[PDB]
């Protein structure tokens, strides 16, 4: 009876195995754009993905994940609210059954069709496991997806999903450039939060870009053909793999922009 996104194992159940689900620093949140304050103390954000080394793509039964060689400083995030150097380790998505839902963060209660999470760890903690336990150990760059025009930089991901339909399947995914998933603007909101999946560690600095990327209906339809189930189990389409907004509690969301 392990965690998932169903009626019987979904986000309303996770607190029983992971009591921090009802904590003071949970993610995602609704971003109230009126409440969020411009922060002039935020340093320039640096998304340095030129030397990224993608390795594999994996269906983990929750999402699909692209992992990166993070054995040295290749693709890194620094600046903005961050101190020091955070290495890209993986990206994955969250998406819906319909184009009006799928994102984890919301913006003035607006849900997007999907959300991309680029997961990074603080190199002062030497590895991602040790980082994942420190209050400033992880940084996740969140990008909303809306349905409209195709995103050419996403198509190499969409075209391999056929090969990883079921939980436990992986494929080679070398020479993928995550710069092709970024919008033009790096305007962002930031707040202290958590992983949005078990174990829900309160160890994430969230950086959520204001500008969504457009993807086509054909691209998001391909996400919805994935399966939560393993090969030769009953088919359960991998859709609505998002946690809803959690209480903001005593936190401030800071904007990088006026």
Q: Supply the residues annotated as catalytic.
A: 62
What's the CA gap between 134 and 54, in Å, rounded? 25
What number of residues does the chain have? 258
What's the CA gap between 216 and 219, in Å, rounded? 5
4, 17, 134, 170 from 191: Cα distances, Å: 25, 25, 16, 33
Q: Is 116 in the site for ligand A1H11 (CB under 6 A)?
A: no
**Is 92 part of any known ligand binding site?**
yes
Region of 13-21, 112-120, 181-189, 222-230 interacting with Zn ion (CB under 5 A): 112-120
**Is 117 part of any known ligand binding site?**
yes
- Closest CA relative to residue 161, chosen from 215, 239, 227, 115: 227
- If one counts every other C-beta atom within 10 angstroms of the C-beta of residue 91, the result is 25
Region of 151-159, 193-201, 210-218, 247-255 interacting with ligand A1H11 (CB under 6 A): 193-201
Q: Is 59 in the site for ligand A1H11 (CB under 6 A)?
A: no
Residues in 209-248 that interact with ligand A1H11 by CB under 6 A: 241
Adjacent-strand bridge partners of 171: 57
What's the CA gap between 187 and 134, in Å, rounded? 26
CB closer to ligand A1H11 out of 43 and 72: 72
- Which of 119, 145, 220, 248 binds ligand A1H11 (CB under 6 A)? It is 119
What's the CA gap between 196 and 164, in Å, rounded? 23
Tell me how far, at minimum, the Cβ of 41 lies from ligand A1H11, in Å: 26
CB closer to ligand A1H11 out of 95 and 176: 95
CA dihedral sign, ordered 198, 11, 241, 183: negative
- Which of 116, 140, 158, 220 binds ligand A1H11 (CB under 6 A)? It is 140
CB closer to ligand A1H11 out of 39 and 132: 132
Contacts (Cβ under 8 Å, ≥6 apart) of 174:
53, 54, 55
Binding footprint of ligand A1H11, residue count (CB under 6 A): 17
- As to burial, measured by CB atoms within 10 angstroms (0-12 exposed, 13-18 middle, 19+ buried), residue 207 is buried
CB closer to Zn ion out of 39 and 198: 198
Contacts (Cβ under 8 Å, ≥6 apart) of 129:
none
Q: Is 117 in the site for Zn ion (CB under 5 A)?
A: yes
CB closer to Zn ion out of 79 and 198: 198
**Is 190 part of any known ligand binding site?**
no
Q: Residues annotated in the binding site for Zn(2+), as ranges? A: 92, 94, 117
Binding positions for Zn ion, rule: CB under 5 A:
117
Binding positions for ligand A1H11, rule: CB under 6 A:
60, 62-63, 89-90, 92, 117, 119, 128-129, 132, 138, 140, 195-197, 241
Q: Residues annotated in the binding site, as ranges? A: 92, 94, 117, 196-197
């Amino acid at each position: 009876h392990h965690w998932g996104y169903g009626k019987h194992n979904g986000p309303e159940h996770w607190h029983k195995d992971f009591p921090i689900a009802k904590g003071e620093r949970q993610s995602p949140v609704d971003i109230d754009t009126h409440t969020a304050k411009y922060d002039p103390s935020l340093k320039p954000l640096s998304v340095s993905y030129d030397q990224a080394t993608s390795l594999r793509i994996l269906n983990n039964g929750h999402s699909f994940k692209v992992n990166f060689d993070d054995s040295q400083d290749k693709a890194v995030l620094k600046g903005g609210p961050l101190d020091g150097t955070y290495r890209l380790t993986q990206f994955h998505f969250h998406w819906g059954s319909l184009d009006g839902q799928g994102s984890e963060h919301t913006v003035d209660k607006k849900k997007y069709a999907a959300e991309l999470h680029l997961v990074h760890w603080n190199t002062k903690y030497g590895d991602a496991s040790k980082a994942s336990q420190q209050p400033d150990g992880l940084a996740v760059l969140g990008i909303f997806l809306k349905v409209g025009s195709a995103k050419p930089g996403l198509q190499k991901v969409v075209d391999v999903l056929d090969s990883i339909k079921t939980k436990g399947k992986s494929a080679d995914f070398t020479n993928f450039d995550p710069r092709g998933l970024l919008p033009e603007s790096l305007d962002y909101w930031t707040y202290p939060g958590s992983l949005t999946t078990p174990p829900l560690n309160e160890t994430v600095t969230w950086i959520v870009l204001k500008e969504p990327i457009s993807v086509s209906s054909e691209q998001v339809l391909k996400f919805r053909k994935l399966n939560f189930n393993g090969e030769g189990e009953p088919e359960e389409l991998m859709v609505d793999n998002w946690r809803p907004a959690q209480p903001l509690k005593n936190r401030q969301i800071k904007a990088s922009f006026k």
